[PDB]
Design a protein around this ligand. Sequence first.
Ligand SMILES: O=c1[nH]c(=O)c2[nH+]cn([C@@H]3O[C@H](COP(=O)(O)O)[C@@H](O)[C@H]3O)c2[nH]1
Ligand SMILES: O=c1[nH]c(=O)c2[nH+]cn([C@@H]3O[C@H](COP(=O)(O)O)[C@@H](O)[C@H]3O)c2[nH]1
Lengths: 475, 467
Amino acid sequence: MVLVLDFGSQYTRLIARRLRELRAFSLILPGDAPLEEVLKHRPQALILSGGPRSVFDPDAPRPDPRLFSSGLPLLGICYGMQLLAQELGGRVERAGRAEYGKALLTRHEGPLFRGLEGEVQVWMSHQDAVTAPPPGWRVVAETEENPVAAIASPDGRAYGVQFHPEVAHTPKGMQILENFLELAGVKRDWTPEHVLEELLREVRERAGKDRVLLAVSGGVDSSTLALLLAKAGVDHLAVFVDHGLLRLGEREEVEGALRALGVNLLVVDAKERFLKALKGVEDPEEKRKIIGREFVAAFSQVARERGPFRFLAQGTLYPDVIEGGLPEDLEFELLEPFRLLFKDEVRELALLLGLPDTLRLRHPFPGPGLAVRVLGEVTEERLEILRRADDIFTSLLREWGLYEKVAQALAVLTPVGYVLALRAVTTEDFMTADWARLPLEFLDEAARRITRRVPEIGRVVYDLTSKPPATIEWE
Amino acid sequence: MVLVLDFGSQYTRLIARRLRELRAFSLILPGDAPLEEVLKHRPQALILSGGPRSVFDPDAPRPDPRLFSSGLPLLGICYGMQLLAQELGGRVERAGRAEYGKALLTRHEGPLFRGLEGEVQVWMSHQDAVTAPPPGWRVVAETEENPVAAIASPDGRAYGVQFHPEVAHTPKGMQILENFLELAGVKRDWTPEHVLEELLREVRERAGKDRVLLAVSGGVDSSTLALLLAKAGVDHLAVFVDHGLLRLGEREEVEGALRALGVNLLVVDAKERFLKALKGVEDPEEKRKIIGREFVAAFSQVARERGPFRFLAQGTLYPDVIEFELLEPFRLLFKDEVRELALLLGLPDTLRLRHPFPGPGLAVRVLGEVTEERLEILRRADDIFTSLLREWGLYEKVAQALAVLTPVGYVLALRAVTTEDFMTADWARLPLEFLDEAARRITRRVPEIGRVVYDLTSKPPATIEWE
Ligand SMILES: O=c1[nH]c(=O)c2[nH+]cn([C@@H]3O[C@H](COP(=O)(O)O)[C@@H](O)[C@H]3O)c2[nH]1
Ligand SMILES: O=c1[nH]c(=O)c2[nH+]cn([C@@H]3O[C@H](COP(=O)(O)O)[C@@H](O)[C@H]3O)c2[nH]1
């Protein structure tokens, strides 16, 4: 268990994910947290993230002084390296500006850097500088502008880096993090079989003879949660609400696979209800309000009729922890087996649970579905048009091997006569995303087939906007 | 002057243009024209185009038999090669279906294939087929499935080809047409100075000392016309009607260059008129109608307030051909040829190499009703797109670029195409890195634009403009 002490860096979650990609469990904890707190979990190592403020800024978070006196192997990143320096007898001074930049390490030596030969580009932090490492420590790295890009204690237990190894701009950062783990002798217990073993155990003990209620959307999160309950053999009822806003053929694909795998599934046909409720509504916020409201209604009705249900399982993920509404009279005990996992780790568990690639590798799709993909009132005719265009887009992407090369793809119908907007992005965290640069020949093919097979569509465009400044969905 | 006999081919205008590119004047005439009409222009050579209907089709166009016994060098293309066959003893039979196809000539010999070595890809017509050439002719070309790709007369003055040498899909087609002109001994009098001289003379005589009124829009066409009049010492009143729907700084660039060149220019401020007249209107149709009505009103008023004007000069072009006396000195030219004259008339590249811009201007580029605010948003986005295109050296690599403002809050659609004739058009495959730069610069510098989009639609099925 490696502890990530968060000092505000926008890459903190990233640090935690990289550790797991190196088969080490990672947990995040605010930087300024009592020593008893950071230790109560038995950290095998510690990592001090960076932060947007200078170590000179009084508002900037400070760790527990005792922290540096625990004997725990530790790595300091940017702000973290500077904290480590001044807090131990080294000298840090103001310099540069709070910004990043690519830089080549003109010197990189010692165990922290093995495997890294040739050019070693790093994503340097330009805010301040340690000009003197703690007395007795070694400067194991430099760039042209900074004679001290990394430091290490004489016993090889603590290290500091003036750059971000968890970021893509430091292509060899993973190896550096891997060297650190190897150095701190961190056990690599974070494997999928280990996770599965634990979750089944837990879910069985907790659920007991009782029955679990769960909502299923088609997404891989809830699907894997369903498979978990079934495989664990706990009594449960998975509820799939067909709001009639799903992609072409989605309901059948989902119901067929989950049932074949053994989940007690109940499909609710609420298409008419949702469409009715959505009549004349353009405001995307209102659409979501209405969708959320119709959904909690049909779901509660099911819970009551098929009840009682002692537990309500949810697919809460670690990102949710680190930051609809059921009727008050409906009381449930929460079962959240994935609360310490990242989305991709659940996709891995799905593999061990027997979920087929058809569903295990599909892209995320929103709760309000196609309703947020028609700019304007949602009508049955508009959905029929968007469903068709969307289907053709997804199929071409799969045909040309491009589907697995984007994090998400979608089509948006814009009434004029219709203009269809194709949209695909690349992202890890869905919180910053770049427009996907699909081949021009592919875009031409997608546009010709759409206007060809869906004559109501008179023009096709491709969204060139990243996030920031724009959202992934158009509304 | 080479004559093109039109038998219906969608590539007929292309044939005419290629010849000009080969410095030979060219004119088009219906394929079923009287021999007398065909010969009054004293053509040095004739070219029979292709056509959609079979030579067996009774309603299909027929030439004047005598035309084949006129002693003039001729080239029959597809449907044209068929006529050439049957009308002279050869045999032509039904085959395949009216469609085209790329094919390699398995053999190509003769002065018609002079210089076309290596492989020769042609765009073959699959509608019927010459199975036997006229007696005495030589099948100087073949393909895999078709033994008679091209035929040549024994006198080496007539030729037929089962492919379209005028289309890009026949890469070396221009060389074949060049070889035929050489054979035909065609003189190359189609040069810019000859055109300018001829045009200065005419304009001068036709107008004499009367008053000729012409409208300048900003387009290289109107501008060149204005410069032609001035250069010819003709008395004119160039009228530039600023409807307030132009591109950033367009008016200042046009009046400054035209005045500096000697054009008697009068710019009319009608910004308000057009703006007020367009309030609340969204129908693309109405906009154009409204804009047109307002322009005439504005133009008519100056025609009177400063009349009388015997002549009304217009920049009518050949493709067009294909209380006022009209003076159209360009009706036999293509736009590109007018750009060439504009060079000789000393027009600066800044206005001489600009992409076309519609009369309704930005009014047809606002998906919805036009307003001053929306216009300002669009004008700044449009400006940025143009500038980036010029900076990257892409502006000259596309036939037209434009931006459409879609009120949603605004989504902006970038749109560029490549075209020969604006009557077909492909969406321009701009570099991905470039579109990224364009999208970021726009949302950054024009905050009201929250999303930038790129149009992937060709013509057909869609129009170049969004309305
Ligand atoms: O379950 C959902 N209900 C919603 O209302 C919703 N809105 C956006 N999304 C998804 O979240 C990610 C980010 O989309 P945005 O950049 O537009 O916020 C993308 O993956 C979106 O598909 C939703 N998911
Ligand atoms: O003078 C003009 N007045 C107009 O109303 C107009 N509408 C379209 N265009 C131009 O004509 C070409 C083809 O545009 P479309 O494929 O949308 O018809 C393109 O070059 C268009 O810019 C216009 N020019």
